[model samples]
Target: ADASQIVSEMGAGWNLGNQLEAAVNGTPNETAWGNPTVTPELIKKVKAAGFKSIRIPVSYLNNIGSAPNYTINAAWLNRIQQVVDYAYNEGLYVIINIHGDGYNSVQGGWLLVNGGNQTAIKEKYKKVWQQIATKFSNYNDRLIFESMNEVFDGNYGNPNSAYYTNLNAYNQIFVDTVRQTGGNNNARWLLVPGWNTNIDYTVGNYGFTLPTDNYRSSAIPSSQKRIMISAHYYSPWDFAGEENGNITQWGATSTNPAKKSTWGQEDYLESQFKSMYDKFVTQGYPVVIGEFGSIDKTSYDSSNNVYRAAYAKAVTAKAKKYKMVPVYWDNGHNGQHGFALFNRSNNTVTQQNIINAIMQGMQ
Candidate 1:
């Protein structure tokens, strides 16, 4: 099968959020964000809970060496592989990427597109991928490599040409660098996110460019594409993430209209997915709704759970409609303003309604 086929086979993906990707002052600290160390039991629990894939976001800022070598720390890389094995061995499709290095707000982030050092950043980016790709070179196709996560120019406005172009260049470099590893990496499915992984800027008139996988394409079947576009869905932040206690409910199932967000409802959500489908999926490239979920607001509105479940169902259904993969974002926070479905501390489900709703959408 092609990359699209492989992606579709990964039914109802979930992010191992705030775990391997969590950092403290640019240093890898799995528990820094208050999430416990990831265990095989946790991955097993996730798989048994009906998740077909896991996206493990990682950061390499402090773990990476400076200048010409740009080598990743052996211990950090090994720890990452151990965690990945927990899922990969269980027959789950796994995704690992250079996360947190792009967020300017986060300390030790130096991969900024508009940070005024493209030459050095590009070299560092390529070298970093080289080590990662080489380390996992022998892994099977079940393992996927994502270039970066939520990368931006720190502007948060319309995509700046200069910044977007640099972002595109990074994708190009990722493809070339990974393929240069000369193993399963050559034919591995590579994921590249647009400006901040936003759907609007990616499929819109922005400068998002698809990498030319000319090197790896020849090795794969003519019908398949190794590149996939990654985007995040978090529209109407007031309902999805805001903690002001204003908008708590989501979706049309909300009992209180006053608590529901006016925008980013059913129509807006479907429209965004449809645009991505028309722009990317139709062209043989698969789209990954890399992250999407509403935070817990049960404190503000008791019926918020139902609305949150409805939002998950609708998002999964829409993603299925557009042949895109939806991976729910779980920051490992199960309390107020949290997007967690499973409690990492105990490896038990914290949000049964959302999980059941996701299965309903899968059906």
Candidate 2:
């Protein structure tokens, strides 16, 4: 229990609405209501997968937004709390968070600046976290809380700029809310994602955001370290994301098709992940590849021969060298971008393939 240091969140298809959006990021809206049903049984299996941590991404606005103060219904909170308890009770570390709750990729418009009016925005933000922090005061140690997820530009450059601008101030609200929790949360390990939650920006220029100014990590009246930065990696998305439709297919089929020539060989993928690890080491910061996976090829069989060998060797090597943990987002059967470890049918989720990939990556 040296803290849930190295971890991976349950994501890569957690979406907000029933549309493709909510299905990818784990934030299925109200309509999706416990849709897929992540039960205690599922948590048990997940913990058994050799993973010490489970990060549950939630979208509270799904049930609250339409209300006066965006009030979240008790039924919803009760349901969410059940899953959180499931993870903790299983003796597993848990990280619960606001995953893209503030308008997808529109965080800049909503967080600060206030669209030229700061008062309302500030009030809204404080109110939101206040309510959230107050409600969760009961959850203990193994439960970690995150400010937000991937709040950045939908495309590129300065993705986390707005986040950086208001983080120092906003985090104060977050810190205050958590501190007021008054129990185990009094000194819990609170994880803060870097601007737009990007590695390059976080490890480098942070747009004038300062933690001390807000008493963050100050240990004022508390003995806990209190703060840590989060950065995510998804390299060679060009390669892994191709079949997922994020990128065009390089060949006629999903296997090592002819189109793969577009991305060169396995060495390219290896170098890609290595670069990320190298960057983190130089920055002297703790990092996690919040998401990483490849499409399951019909030709590779469950062993996922070629793809497994290549991805495993490359990623595992980088992760081991940096002493970082690798977390796989499940996508049942490795279909396209999904990392399905197993299904209710009791059929194993290409575990052999993932194990090989992890072993290779650890190399």
Candidate 3:
């Protein structure tokens, strides 16, 4: 069994979003985003609710130092470890990554490929990941290291060739650095995303290259790959995240055609996943649909829950069918435009309909 075996074992996932990665003015505070401090009880509720995996998105903004060592704050690292332990101890696969540092709109974002001097940027990236890998070096394979999140050259649409080349270089550096940490890390499954984690940018001929896996441990079979590709799904802007947009309905289940998004429907979604399957999964490299979910718009149309549930169910089914793992993003806000499925206050299910839809889609 190779990386695909781990992929199959991953099952359905829930992202511990807007928690660890939450920041304000480039300064990080776990509770900065209106979410409560994560508790072990919260993860327990997740496991009981049937999520097989968890994704902990973290940012190394002020938690890291400058220059040669690019030293990461020890206490911050320990805090991250504690969070990872919360999910890992629950017998669920966990993923943690360098987030918030790559967005243009954020205050302390620094992983910019086109934001100037490449030499310093990559050097810091390598050391940051090296530190993270060394900290978790002894952990089992269930713990995964994803490089970065939603990184791009500030332009959301088309990718800049020069910036993307640097992005690929960062992936290579990430893979090499983590593998050098030795122990389980050499064989640990690593996840890397292309420009903005967009499927079109990653799966297409857009210069998104897979890092060389040769630096991995020799103890494992050479045939087994330890690296995975990451992609995010929030297609059809009108229905997924467009707050004021009226197109809240999605998929074939939509009764009102007027409320349905014209594009990113069933046929379009199938084609996208099929492309990833043919290009990567067929070659043994697994794909992780790292984030996918519709924000709560029930306040607007009331029936938005039906369409939102349908989208989640359909996304999970297609991702599973195509050999990709689907992880739902829950920013912990339950009001309008919030993607939360569980309320962290009491660790109770908030959007049970969407939750049930995801569980059913897992089958």
Candidate 4:
């Protein structure tokens, strides 16, 4: 199947953030971060709400066995598979990735891909991907595997940095491992991202590379051009990520438009998407906006809701226009700067206006 067609079917994705990705005291639990446990009904609600795909971010740092083997806990695997089945059974495209599992000084995760630990990192990364691919090898092409999320190597802005090299190596390992699993995975579409999944860096600075689809001893390629580039968009951090005053209003009609809404308006969004379309999609590589959203700072000031809706509509519409799949980031937190869209407990959309705006963009 063509990668472009697969991505079009994956239109308007949603992230099940902070749920299965949550780790507290070294344990992976969906409700650890405040969202209720994932259920079939929740997935049904998501599908009914106009999202054609679901991005399930799962963290394996707390549930995997010690290195050398890196065996995953069967219970955790079963739990994840159950939720994935719920989404797939509902006929929704599903994407799963290693989320919140990056290595950092504050929070420890084993995916420490860097020049210093290249050999060890490759070993462990291959172990994880091999296991994941082998486990879900029988599933059809509707299930997609994402290599990593927000990968960083201490140096964030340097072009062709060592971190970028390590990321490239990990992606190669992921593609190789999955294709060798020998099932529907041979033709499954995979997603690879550059350092931090930042579009500008990926297009300009970061040494982003696509993995070869060939495996050992294969005269012909198993999956021809089946990889897609993944990146996140949270432009104008003050308006989309800030939690303080005067950051709520955005776009041209915003209060103090010259200052607060000056940057990252509709024009900026269009430019960004255009860059991705020209750089990747036009070259036969499908692009997926893995995460994008305007923080709901309504608690600080309710007026931001209107601007947030407009921002949401702008991104969704622009993404569709450029043939880039846009996935909204929702962690199910209903406070200041929260991105919660659905009420898991009651299985209802918390903000119908935002949903309507997103749908309007699709139309």
Candidate 5:
């Protein structure tokens, strides 16, 4: 299918966070972080909430066998497939990716793309994608594969650095491996992210390149446009993601505007989306805000709920205006700074205000 059609189908997206990507004692668990078990009913709730797509993030390192084959455990693979099936069966555009494997100096994950392990990492990456692609080879276009999530390898500003080079290498391997599977994946809409999936880094300093492929439509000229850029937006970190020092509310409309809360308003949000538009969408690659949301730090200040609602509305609205897909990052934690949207325990939406805000923003 065409990229435009795919984006239109995606509509609003949501991340199944703190579930499949949740880790406990170094092992990935669907409920490791205290979320209820994922079920078709939960997916039904998501689809019912006006979301058209679901981003299912998974980590295979803990379950996969070591070495040459890097075989993914059957139970884990089956479990992931089962969750994907729930969304697919619900007719939602599903995106599955190698998530939670991002590593840096302090934090450790499975996939590292530095010069020290570039060749070895690529080998492991290819093996994982090969298995994932082949396993879901028969799945329809409703299901898509995302390359990586927030990969932090070291270099941030320079394109010539090993970080950007290795990131591109992994993306290239991802596309080549999936297309070689010889099924719907050949034409599947693959989401490739730049370094850290940061909008500024992706469009500015990073030397990012879209993978070239040959799956096509007579409606369009080539298949290279099938690729979509993935980026995350947690701009104005103090308001959106910060968890301390009374910087809870955000934007100009914030009722409790502190010194750091006045930024990231509507215009600023629109400009960020415009950057993605000028850099990628205008260049034929659509951009997906794979993860974007303001934390609900309302416990610190009850007025934060209103600021979060406004933030959600502005993000969704601007992303829609730019024709970019915005997926809210929900961690399933209802406490301070948590981005939980749905009460997974009962498969019910906890914050109708935020949900209504996103829907209105999309409108």
Candidate 6:
């Protein structure tokens, strides 16, 4: 779904966290988010594997919060721009997004506190997009803009809150702001995720329940592609995300990958996830798996890594089988579900091996 690239690959599980603030001020402390130094060698390696898209996640609360105009930090923007330029120079499409401004999309706070009908919230959201558009407007079609990153169920505990009906309002402002900029981003395929940033929330029945006023209507403008849905898949998160439970980590605390089927709890992962895209794919509408990954460490310790690779193969197989593209979200270390495509661990899968394996398996 990225600027017409056949299959785009982007960074996921990247949290600017507080490290961005540090990176901006000139103290480039190492972070688990992205390799602070994503050399051309890395870009070449990635593109050489047949990947046509690259996604770079950013953190920008400092710029958005400290000023009403909400300027994108100059230094930070330069760093991100460098990566996008690298990808574009390599002939790969790039998608860049404010990963988590931490203003909205976290949970209840997104809609209730940061979204909604309030003039202040609306102004800030507008300002944020304004800064983004104004800053990156110079880029060409090779770059894609995502409105927000998984502004889902608070990621804290408010799973059913729906941001108190302000969800739709939040998105409309996002669209209007981007459109107002009037550049490549104007008619560019702006990607917008569903209620919780998942297919179910973005495209199904009752998808248009909230924020009738400021919220962007389902009716898309004739001149604009508007947006696409975004979501992440981490099956049996207890096993995939929990520190002790995940097989990616060598700890012996939870269910074993020996019982891998126990982890395939598929309300979606098995069937619904793919079936959901059938209608869109047939219609030639853009639908995608913006984020997906499992710890590759299962290969070394638990069989989960094997199952992870198998599950990925199955997911991508199904995606390819259906002509849809699935992007794997890697956090770069075993600490984060061992999903790193380039294992940073001494004894884990080699970087080149994971890269070759994923590309080959997905193909």
Q: What is the C-alpha lDDT profile of model 2 across 1-363, one tens digit per residue?
A: 222243223211111111111432333443342234555776676666555666676665444453237566667677667877877797766666666454444322355321444455556666666666676777765677776666553545764555456655566667666666556565665666656555666655657343432333234333324444555554445645545433323222435353354553445544544554565434433345555555554342443445544564455555556555555555343344444655633534455655555644543
lDDT of 5 by residue, 70-124 (tens): 8989888899999999999888999999887765532237677664877777888
Candidate 4, residues 54-124, lDDT tens digits: the string is 99999887687878998999999999999899999988989999877775632547686654667776898
What would the per-residue lDDT of candidate 3 be over residues 1-363, giving only the tens digit for each residue? 376788788999999999889898877879999999999999999889898999999998877797989999898899999999999988899999999998877888899988787898899999999999999999998999999999997777778888899899989999999999867998888999999999888988878888897788887787667888899999987899888758878999888888898789999999999988998888778899999999888887889999999999999999989989999999999898999998899888998989899999989
| Residue 357 Cα positional deviation in candidate 1, in Å, after optimal superposition | 0.4
Q: What's the TM for model 2?
A: 0.72
- Candidate 4 regions off by >4 Å? 154-156, 216-224
Q: What is candidate 2's CA lDDT for residue 265?
A: 48
Residue 188, model 3: lDDT of: 85
Worst 10 residues of 2 by lDDT: 11-20
lDDT of 6 by residue, 1-363 (tens): 332243334321122122222233323322634444455565565566555666666656544444366565677667767766777787666666655543353221322333445666667668877877777776766667776666654454344444624556666777777766755656555555555555555445534332122223334444324355455666655545554543442122324545333544533464656754654554444555666655544444544554555555555555555555566665555433455654332223444444554566565
2 or 3, greater by TM-score: 3
Question: Whose TM-score is higher: candidate 1's or candidate 5's?
Answer: 1
Query: On TM-score, who's better, 2 or 5?
Result: 5
Q: Work out the TM-score per prediction.
A: 0.98, 0.72, 0.98, 0.94, 0.94, 0.74
RMSD of each: 1.1, 5.8, 1.0, 2.2, 2.1, 5.9
| Residue 162 local lDDT, model 5 | 65
lDDT of each model, Cα atoms only? 0.89, 0.52, 0.90, 0.82, 0.82, 0.53
